[PDB]
Design an enzyme around this catalytic site. Structure first.
Site, PDB file in Angstrom:
ATOM      1  N   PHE C 121      31.906  47.883  37.284  1.00 22.16           N
ATOM      2  CA  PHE C 121      32.719  46.787  36.752  1.00 22.16           C
ATOM      3  C   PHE C 121      31.856  45.706  36.108  1.00 22.16           C
ATOM      4  CE2 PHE C 121      37.075  46.953  36.876  1.00 22.16           C
ATOM      5  CZ  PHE C 121      37.724  45.764  37.204  1.00 22.16           C
ATOM      6  N   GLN C 242      39.460  31.548  33.355  1.00 22.02           N
ATOM      7  CA  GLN C 242      38.700  32.757  33.057  1.00 22.02           C
ATOM      8  C   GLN C 242      39.448  33.576  32.044  1.00 22.02           C
ATOM      9  OE1 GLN C 242      38.831  36.203  35.360  1.00 22.02           O
ATOM     10  NE2 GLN C 242      36.681  36.847  35.053  1.00 22.02           N
ATOM     11  N   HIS C 244      40.010  36.908  30.165  1.00 25.90           N
ATOM     12  CA  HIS C 244      39.702  38.318  30.319  1.00 25.90           C
ATOM     13  C   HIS C 244      39.337  38.798  28.943  1.00 25.90           C
ATOM     14  CE1 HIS C 244      39.790  42.544  31.506  1.00 25.90           C
ATOM     15  NE2 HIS C 244      39.967  42.153  32.756  1.00 25.90           N
ATOM     16  N   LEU C 254      47.183  43.228  30.268  1.00 23.36           N
ATOM     17  CA  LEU C 254      45.832  43.635  30.593  1.00 23.36           C
ATOM     18  C   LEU C 254      45.495  45.080  30.275  1.00 23.36           C
ATOM     19  CD1 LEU C 254      43.343  42.447  31.712  1.00 23.36           C
ATOM     20  CD2 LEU C 254      43.863  43.592  33.887  1.00 23.36           C
ATOM     21  N   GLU C 257      39.006  46.145  33.119  1.00 24.33           N
ATOM     22  CA  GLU C 257      37.567  46.210  32.902  1.00 24.33           C
ATOM     23  C   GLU C 257      37.096  47.584  33.354  1.00 24.33           C
ATOM     24  OE1 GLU C 257      35.065  43.097  34.922  1.00 24.33           O
ATOM     25  OE2 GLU C 257      34.273  42.924  32.858  1.00 24.33           O
ATOM     26  N   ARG C 288      32.546  38.292  32.582  1.00 24.74           N
ATOM     27  CA  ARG C 288      33.661  38.273  31.661  1.00 24.74           C
ATOM     28  C   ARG C 288      33.655  36.960  30.874  1.00 24.74           C
ATOM     29  NH1 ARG C 288      37.401  42.037  35.477  1.00 24.74           N
ATOM     30  NH2 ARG C 288      38.919  40.313  35.522  1.00 24.74           N
ATOM     31  N   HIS C 355      43.496  34.660  32.120  1.00 23.72           N
ATOM     32  CA  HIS C 355      43.665  35.666  33.166  1.00 23.72           C
ATOM     33  C   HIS C 355      43.824  35.156  34.620  1.00 23.72           C
ATOM     34  CE1 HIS C 355      43.456  39.839  34.439  1.00 23.72           C
ATOM     35  NE2 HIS C 355      42.639  39.458  35.404  1.00 23.72           N
ATOM     36  N   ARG C 400      34.842  33.832  38.119  1.00 23.92           N
ATOM     37  CA  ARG C 400      35.222  34.921  39.027  1.00 23.92           C
ATOM     38  C   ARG C 400      34.769  36.278  38.519  1.00 23.92           C
ATOM     39  NH1 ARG C 400      39.805  38.619  37.791  1.00 23.92           N
ATOM     40  NH2 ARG C 400      39.156  40.396  39.072  1.00 23.92           N
TER      41      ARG C 400
HETATM   42  C1  LIG Z   1      47.092  39.065  36.183  1.00 18.87           C
HETATM   43  C2  LIG Z   1      46.159  40.113  36.689  1.00 18.87           C
HETATM   44  C3  LIG Z   1      45.312  39.755  37.727  1.00 18.87           C
HETATM   45  C4  LIG Z   1      44.430  40.708  38.223  1.00 18.87           C
HETATM   46  C5  LIG Z   1      44.406  41.996  37.665  1.00 18.87           C
HETATM   47  C6  LIG Z   1      45.262  42.353  36.631  1.00 18.87           C
HETATM   48  C7  LIG Z   1      46.145  41.412  36.140  1.00 18.87           C
HETATM   49  C8  LIG Z   1      47.033  41.851  35.022  1.00 18.87           C
HETATM   50  N1  LIG Z   1      43.538  42.948  38.140  1.00 18.87           N
HETATM   51  C9  LIG Z   1      42.689  42.636  39.174  1.00 18.87           C
HETATM   52  C10 LIG Z   1      41.816  43.603  39.638  1.00 18.87           C
HETATM   53  O1  LIG Z   1      41.821  44.743  39.115  1.00 18.87           O
HETATM   54  N2  LIG Z   1      40.963  43.257  40.687  1.00 18.87           N
HETATM   55  C11 LIG Z   1      40.981  41.990  41.251  1.00 18.87           C
HETATM   56  O2  LIG Z   1      40.227  41.685  42.182  1.00 18.87           O
HETATM   57  N3  LIG Z   1      41.846  41.052  40.759  1.00 18.87           N
HETATM   58  C12 LIG Z   1      42.694  41.369  39.735  1.00 18.87           C
HETATM   59  N4  LIG Z   1      43.562  40.404  39.264  1.00 18.87           N
HETATM   60  C13 LIG Z   1      43.582  39.051  39.936  1.00 18.87           C
HETATM   61  C14 LIG Z   1      44.388  39.193  41.259  1.00 18.87           C
HETATM   62  O3  LIG Z   1      45.341  40.223  41.195  1.00 18.87           O
HETATM   63  C15 LIG Z   1      45.239  38.014  41.637  1.00 18.87           C
HETATM   64  O4  LIG Z   1      44.477  36.856  41.553  1.00 18.87           O
HETATM   65  C16 LIG Z   1      45.712  38.202  43.072  1.00 18.87           C
HETATM   66  O5  LIG Z   1      46.961  38.856  43.075  1.00 18.87           O
HETATM   67  C17 LIG Z   1      45.850  36.896  43.852  1.00 18.87           C
HETATM   68  O6  LIG Z   1      46.728  37.100  44.928  1.00 18.87           O
HETATM   69  P1  LIG Z   1      47.776  35.952  45.277  1.00 18.87           P
HETATM   70  O7  LIG Z   1      48.601  36.395  46.469  1.00 18.87           O
HETATM   71  O8  LIG Z   1      47.023  34.657  45.549  1.00 18.87           O
HETATM   72  O9  LIG Z   1      48.657  35.779  43.946  1.00 18.87           O
HETATM   73  P2  LIG Z   1      50.063  36.501  43.822  1.00 18.87           P
HETATM   74  O10 LIG Z   1      49.785  37.929  44.165  1.00 18.87           O
HETATM   75  O11 LIG Z   1      50.699  36.323  42.474  1.00 18.87           O
HETATM   76  O12 LIG Z   1      51.077  35.771  44.821  1.00 18.87           O
HETATM   77  C18 LIG Z   1      52.328  35.356  44.312  1.00 18.87           C
HETATM   78  C19 LIG Z   1      53.256  34.892  45.425  1.00 18.87           C
HETATM   79  O13 LIG Z   1      53.354  33.483  45.388  1.00 18.87           O
HETATM   80  C20 LIG Z   1      54.720  33.124  45.402  1.00 18.87           C
HETATM   81  N5  LIG Z   1      55.124  31.801  44.865  1.00 18.87           N
HETATM   82  C21 LIG Z   1      54.576  31.066  43.855  1.00 18.87           C
HETATM   83  N6  LIG Z   1      55.315  29.938  43.723  1.00 18.87           N
HETATM   84  C22 LIG Z   1      56.325  29.936  44.629  1.00 18.87           C
HETATM   85  C23 LIG Z   1      57.361  29.038  44.941  1.00 18.87           C
HETATM   86  N7  LIG Z   1      57.478  27.850  44.337  1.00 18.87           N
HETATM   87  N8  LIG Z   1      58.256  29.343  45.945  1.00 18.87           N
HETATM   88  C24 LIG Z   1      58.108  30.516  46.645  1.00 18.87           C
HETATM   89  N9  LIG Z   1      57.090  31.399  46.329  1.00 18.87           N
HETATM   90  C25 LIG Z   1      56.209  31.110  45.345  1.00 18.87           C
HETATM   91  C26 LIG Z   1      55.414  34.239  44.656  1.00 18.87           C
HETATM   92  O14 LIG Z   1      56.775  34.259  45.022  1.00 18.87           O
HETATM   93  C27 LIG Z   1      54.641  35.433  45.161  1.00 18.87           C
HETATM   94  O15 LIG Z   1      55.200  35.892  46.360  1.00 18.87           O
END
Ligand SMILES: *Cc1cc2c(cc1C)nc1c(=O)[nH]c(=O)nc-1n2C[C@H](O)[C@H](O)[C@H](O)COP(=O)(O)OP(=O)(O)OC[C@H]1O[C@@H](n2cnc3c(N)ncnc32)[C@H](O)[C@@H]1O
Ligand SMILES: C/C=C/CC/C=C/CC/C=C/CCCCCCC(=O)OC[C@H](COP(=O)(O)OCCN)OC(=O)CCCCCCC/C=C/C/C=C/CCC
Ligand code: HEM
Ligand SMILES: CC(C)Oc1cccc(NC(=O)c2ccccc2C(F)(F)F)c1
Ligand code: SF4
Ligand code: F3S
Ligand code: FES
Lengths: 153, 129, 613, 249
Positions: C121, C242, C244, C254, C257, C288, C355, C400
């Site tokens: 990666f 960041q 991408h 996306l 990578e 990146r 990203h 990151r």
């Molecule tokens: C965008 C992205 C990111 C990504 C990736 C590919 C894409 C297209 N590929 C990755 C990879 O191959 N390897 C890696 O290490 N990271 C990769 N990323 C980044 C990573 O996926 C994200 O940063 C990661 O998912 C972070 O996890 P987190 O749990 O912190 O973020 P989330 O999964 O989106 O959580 C969303 C939850 O939060 C809730 N939420 C938000 N606001 C509210 C409100 N107001 N009320 C209630 N809930 C809320 C959402 O509902 C959800 O449950």
């Protein structure tokens, strides 16, 4: 009696009937397609044939006028030979297709040939194959009957 | 605002606890196997009936058919005849029907075999006109 | 208008049901804590599910590896804005926390010796830089993220959580600088809910929707950091967005990578495998920040590709069709759906897109939310915890590292539950609610519900996105920034003139997006003013007016007898925006970067150097 | 220019005992995106913001936006808008679900069922967690292909006329394929009471092998195959044992 999930599931229906939401449209709006139509037709023919077998079995039994004199209560009407093997076809098919399709579904029950081409050819292979063995069983015995009423050398 | 009532959890299914009381052993597996196989074995029969005839054929043809249909309608009846639509005690009624049905179907055929033309011949006795 | 309000009490309440959302929801449920997980969409739908190239751990399944090498790649990758100690806890627990996930049910791709498939990666190496390109990124081929969220969600179903599905977190509940729970609008029936809890965990994801073209989901509107700003916390490092490298030119979804570490590369108008020049050693597998930059230079210096010569090509067609299917099936596909591109025979049109958000809610390695005054160090906000994208332990620093994000999610998720068992002691009972708490959160909801200005919510979101897109992108200038900042504050202003149509509570899609529009604005503004002030180039934040990285020493020369520049003169410090939410004034302030590990006997701290790839 | 006309299911539960209606919306396709979701997003951000539908991911990987477009069930975000402007592309919610509001169905029965399969790895001899990875042959991990990918979107189930009629007892294709997803996992020791669970007349066996499930999947998966394959287990084909963890693991 019911798996716990089934218990819970009923509660759900009642709870949704409780909130009087409407049930989203389903049959009136689902794109007509081969998958569910052939499944339709299978059940349709199924029942229809059982239907006849009941209303025919039971029919003739608890009724004065038996079956031999039925065969007469018809021929003595002026029955066009054309429409007579339209009638015999309407009968061969539901048997021919349900059997054919039937073996097919047993394919599915045991996971054989569920990819969209096998799904979609099966339907075409079984439909036409019904009409073939349905046709060549109505028109075939009409060769030991309408050849022996004309024939050359 | 500052007028609020205390709330209960959301209806949610508990995969562990509400799945450690209930456990009843009765498999419909074993049984499904048989209804397929019968329906299968029932293949040569339909061909063979187009040829070989008589009281003997009449018999097993309209004996097996009773069974295939018995199962079939059951399947059907069980599908549509649903309690959420008919209320519990009508759903019970239609399920009895599927057996009442299965009984008359037999009687009906068994009479028609012993007392009218028989089955096999009742087809010859159409396929000619 | 009239409102129904509802009350529950929990030991801990979690806003967020994503990667970190659940992994912590796992620990806490299992530890026998009465847990509520508030999520504003069914947890599967969460962004974690959209992740691709995998999750890093030094598993040694392709070659011998040491968690310590991974560490080093993380400090470097962060361009030393990374908290040495926080990065430690991450790198050290990696092999376990990934392993754990396997044990959980995660169908990882496999090596012929029946071990977890690892793949190269962006910007990793063996032996503290010396050795070759590393292979640490464990993956469920092309859709790792999908499988992680799906195992976690499953495995969370046996840990006794009370799931509150599609409920919208309005605000944290405060009392004398101590978080006593959370207030959310129930989406389904339209009620409002207050959760008294002993601890509260923020894991809400990032705010990649503050930009016009991104890889983030429509629900990535950065709501948690909004609550944090609203609760009177400063946020950290917002200016580090960041970019991408490889986002589909048209839509911007996306392309991993992975495609690179698997053997693919970027190409310009000439046909030149250009990355060779912008980085000789690690090439198409540099960090990146370096790469997305390289691309944008190539683009702007003429060598762009396609009709407008404004993106580059990711060429994968030179790779064995078999391994291209068995390792990249989803990108292979979403390339055919979106670019309408056959990956075995043509390249993918790609362009850097917004990203991941290193910035967010500040914490210590214990993952507890901090307020830092210069006088008395970082003091902890009682009973408030944050993890995942939306937090800033800064394990990522200024940049990151690819696939340290699902690690960071799970690891510090796990960490929350581990760290809350040790500190919440069940003598301490569930807090009482301050006379009519968050009656104002419910207020701001009425105002936006019946909003009646001249400017639609749709319309405000677009310019705020566009202005961010111009004025805060890859390469920025002191004025082009100042110029965005002005346009930006003008919108936080325009917020009063807000216009909605839908007057309902029962699933008010409109109403909730407008709440989001609020929450983004907080993030955006802050980002841009934090950026406007950093007069140095570091990680993903590159000023044309200050290309230099502004450290204490100049780490280009011996260091022997060089006078250490004072804290007020150099730039190795975390930006720390404090926004007043009603006027939207933002004062800054700058927290020192943590340079000590967790135990200097286990792994020794890594001193700065000239960051090349 | 190009006016596409969409016809969309509409329902307001707040409207004092209102009824469903369809409502026509007109969309200039050169001032619009390329996929149905774009056109929804657009006609809510420009025409009528009281239009309500789930979404998130914009690349068809969350599952959110599943609805019935043009007659069949799919993902708004990844099915192409029909550019023949004389025809009229008509959009409904997942067929036969209870409609919270507009294009939003109630999903909770389907989420319950999923969690009834106990969709987690469970092992016979409890192991120490973080300790080591369990052995799995590459070819037996491949047995999970076409299984793990499911986005739990409910297109299939909501096309299945059996799940239509008896969703309360009949489990439906989605959940079913996933129940299977776990039995053939070589790492899974519960294979035995996993089948034992859906051993009855409806939960598994009310599959009338109809084929909307395989035919409708936007992810080109095939649950029919896996429902069928389950049948085989509820009878007469037993599941392979775990090949032996070779030494050095
Ligand atoms: C965008 C992205 C990111 C990504 C990736 C590919 C894409 C297209 N590929 C990755 C990879 O191959 N390897 C890696 O290490 N990271 C990769 N990323 C980044 C990573 O996926 C994200 O940063 C990661 O998912 C972070 O996890 P987190 O749990 O912190 O973020 P989330 O999964 O989106 O959580 C969303 C939850 O939060 C809730 N939420 C938000 N606001 C509210 C409100 N107001 N009320 C209630 N809930 C809320 C959402 O509902 C959800 O449950
Ligand atoms: C909508 C309307 C629904 C109608 C429902 C009607 C009744 C259904 C009862 C089902 C029982 C069928 C079995 C009888 C049978 O084959 O008849 C023999 C007869 C003796 O011939 P005969 O004319 O007297 O012959 C003597 C000349 N030697 O044959 C016939 O004339 C009846 C036709 C048979 C059906 C076609 C056979 C299809 C084969 C399927 C293929 C698969 C295997 C692989
Ligand atoms: C070799 C010949 C036959 C085969 C292989 C066969 C096969 C099948 C199968 C596999 C089903 C179950 C459909 C399902 O539940 O998935 C079925 C159903 C049924 N069959 Fe047949 N069958 C045969 C002959 C007949 C005949 C001659 C009749 C008419 C008397 C009949 C009447 C029915 C009925 C009423 C059903 C109801 C089930 C449903 O529609 O789903 N079958 N058959
Ligand atoms: C519009 C299409 C998708 O929908 C149609 C609507 C009417 C009912 C059906 N088809 C069945 O009802 C059917 C047919 C054969 C076997 C079992 C069934 C069963 F179980 F009930 F699902 C399909
Ligand atoms: S198998 Fe496909 S259609 Fe069925 S729930 Fe999964 S993603 Fe949806
Ligand atoms: S359509 Fe229904 S019958 Fe089984 S094959 Fe799919 S679940
Ligand atoms: S919106 Fe992500 S699934 Fe359609």
């Amino acid at each position: 009696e019911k798996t716990p999930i089934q218990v819970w599931g009923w509660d759900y229906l009642m709870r949704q009937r409780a909130l009087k939401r409407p049930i989203a449209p389903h049959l009136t709006i689902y794109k007509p397609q081969m998958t569910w139509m052939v499944s339709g037709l299978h059940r349709v023919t199924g029942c229809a044939m059982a239907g006849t077998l009941l209303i025919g079995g039971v029919g003739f039994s608890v009724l004065p006028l038996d079956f031999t004199t039925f065969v007469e209560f018809i021929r003595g009407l002026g029955i066009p030979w054309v429409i007579l093997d339209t009638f015999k076809f309407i009968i061969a098919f539901p048997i021919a297709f349900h059997t054919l399709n039937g073996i097919r579904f047993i394919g599915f029950d045991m996971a054989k040939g569920t990819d969209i081409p096998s799904i979609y050819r099966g339907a075409y292979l079984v439909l036409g194959l019904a009409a073939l063995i349905s046709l060549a069983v109505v028109v075939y015995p009409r060769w030991e009957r309408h050849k022996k009423a004309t024939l050359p050398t | 605002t500052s007028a609020a009532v205390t709330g209960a959890a959301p209806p949610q299914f508990d995969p562990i606890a509400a799945e450690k009381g209930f456990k009843p052993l009765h498999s419909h597996g074993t049984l499904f196997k048989i209804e397929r196989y019968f329906a299968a074995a029932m293949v040569p029969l339909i061909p063979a009936a187009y040829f070989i005839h008589g009281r003997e054929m009449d018999l097993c043809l309209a004996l097996a058919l009773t069974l295939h249909v018995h199962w079939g309608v059951w399947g059907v009846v069980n599908d549509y005849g649903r309690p959420f639509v008919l209320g519990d005690t009508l759903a019970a009624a239609v399920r009895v029907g599927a057996y009442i049905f299965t009984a008359c179907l037999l009687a009906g055929l068994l009479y028609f075999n012993e007392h009218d033309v028989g089955l096999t011949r009742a087809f010859e006795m159409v396929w000619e006109l | 208008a009239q409102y129904k309000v509802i009350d529950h009490a929990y030991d801990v309440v979690i806003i967020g049901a994503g990667g970190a959302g659940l992994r912590a929801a796992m620990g806490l449920g299992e530890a026998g804590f009465k847990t509520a997980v508030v999520t504003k969409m069914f947890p599967t739908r969460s962004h974690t599910t959209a992740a691709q190239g995998g999750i890093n751990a030094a598993l040694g399944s392709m070659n011998p590896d040491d968690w310590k090498w991974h560490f080093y790649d993380t400090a470097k990758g962060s361009d030393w804005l990374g908290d040495q100690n926080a990065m430690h806890y991450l790198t050290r627990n990696a092999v376990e926390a990934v392993t754990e996930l396997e044990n959980f049910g995660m169908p990882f791709s496999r090596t012929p010796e029946g071990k977890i498939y690892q793949r190269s990666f962006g910007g990793q190496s063996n032996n503290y830089g010396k050795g070759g390109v590393a292979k640490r990124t464990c993956c469920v081929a092309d859709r790792t993220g999908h499988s992680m969220l799906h195992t976690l969600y499953g495995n969370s179903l046996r840990c006794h959580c009370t799931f509150f599905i599609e409920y919208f977190a309005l605000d944290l509940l405060m009392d004398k600088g101590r978080c006593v729970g959370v207030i959310a609008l129930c989406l389904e029936d339209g009620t409002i809910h207050r959760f008294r809890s002993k601890r509260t965990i923020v894991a809400t994801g990032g705010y990649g929707r503050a930009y016009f073209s991104c890889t983030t989901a429509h629900m990535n509107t950065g709501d948690g950091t909004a609550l944090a700003t609203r609760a009177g916390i400063a946020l950290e490092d917002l200016e580090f967005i960041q970019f991408h490298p490889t986002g589909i030119y048209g839509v911007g979804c996306l392309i991993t990578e992975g495609s690179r570490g698997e053997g693919g590369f970027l190409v310009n108008s000439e046909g030149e495998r250009f990355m060779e020049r912008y980085a000789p050693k690690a090439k198409d597998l540099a960090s990146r920040d370096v790469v997305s930059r390289a691309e944008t230079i190539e683009i702007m210096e003429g060598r762009g590709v396609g009709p407008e010569k404004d993106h580059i090509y990711l060429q994968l067609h030179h790779l064995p069709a078999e391994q291209l299917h068995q390792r990249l099936p989803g990108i292979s596909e979403t390339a055919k759906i979106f670019a309408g591109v056959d990956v075995t025979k043509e390249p993918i049109p790609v362009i850097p897109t917004v990203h991941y958000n290193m910035g967010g809610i500040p914490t210590n390695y214990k993952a507890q939310v901090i307020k830092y005054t210069k006088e008395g160090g970082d003091k902890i906000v009682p009973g408030l915890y944050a993890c995942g994208e939306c937090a800033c332990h800064s394990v990522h620093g200024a940049n990151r590292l690819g696939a340290n994000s699902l690690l960071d999610a799970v690891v510090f998720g796990r960490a929350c539950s581990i760290n809350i068992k040790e500190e919440l002691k069940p003598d301490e009972k569930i807090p009482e609610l301050p006379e009519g708490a968050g009656e104002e959160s419910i207020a701001n909801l009425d105002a936006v519900r019946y909003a009646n200005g001249d400017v639609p919510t749709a319309e405000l979101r677009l310019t705020m996105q566009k202005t961010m897109q111009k004025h805060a992108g890859v390469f920025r200038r002191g004025d082009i920034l100042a110029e965005g900042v002005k346009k930006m504050m003008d919108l936080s202003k325009e917020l009063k003139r807000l216009k909605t149509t839908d007057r309902s509570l029962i699933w008010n899609s409109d109403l909730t997006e407008s709440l989001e529009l609020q929450n983004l604005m907080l993030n955006a503004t802050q980002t841009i003013v934090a950026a406007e002030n950093r007069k140095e180039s570091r990680g993903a934040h590159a000023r044309d007016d200050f290309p230099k990285r502004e450290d204490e020493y100049d780490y280009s020369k011996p260091i022997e007898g060089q006078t250490k520049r004072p804290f007020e003169k150099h730039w190795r410090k975390h930006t720390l925006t404090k926004q007043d939410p009603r006027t939207g004034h933002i004062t800054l302030d700058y927290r020192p970067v943590i340079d000590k590990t967790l135990d200097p006997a286990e792994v020794d701290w890594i001193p700065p150097i000239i960051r090349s790839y | 220019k190009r006016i596409k006309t969409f016809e969309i299911y509409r329902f307001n539960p707040e409207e004092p005992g209102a009824k469903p209606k369809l409502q026509k919306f007109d969309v200039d396709l050169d001032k619009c995106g390329t996929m149905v979701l774009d056109a929804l997003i657009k006609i809510k951000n420009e025409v009528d913001p009281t239009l309500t539908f789930r979404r998130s991911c914009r690349e068809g990987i969350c599952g959110s936006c599943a609805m019935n477009i043009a007659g069949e069930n799919t993902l708004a975000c990844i099915c192409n808008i029909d550019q023949n402007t004389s025809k009229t592309t008509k959009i409904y919610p997942l067929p036969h679900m209870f409609v919270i509001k507009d294009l939003v169905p109630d999903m909770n029965l389907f989420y319950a069922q999923y969690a009834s399969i106990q969709p987690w790895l469970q092992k016979k001899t409890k192991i120490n967690l973080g300790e080591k990875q369990q052995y799995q042959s590459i070819k037996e991990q491949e047995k999970l292909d076409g299984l793990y990918e499911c986005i739990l979107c409910a297109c299939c189930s909501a096309s299945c006329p059996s799940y239509w009629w008896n969703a309360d007892k009949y489990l439906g294709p989605a959940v079913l394929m996933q129940a299977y997803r776990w039995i053939i996992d070589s790492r899974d020791d519960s294979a035995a009471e996993r089948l034992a669970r859906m051993q009855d007349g409806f939960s598994a066996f009310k599959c009338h092998t109809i084929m909307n499930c395989t035919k409708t999947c936007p992810k080109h998966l095939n649950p029919a195959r896996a429902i069928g394959e389950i049948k085989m287990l509820l009878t007469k084909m037993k599941t392979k044992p775990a090949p032996l963890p070779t030494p050095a693991n």
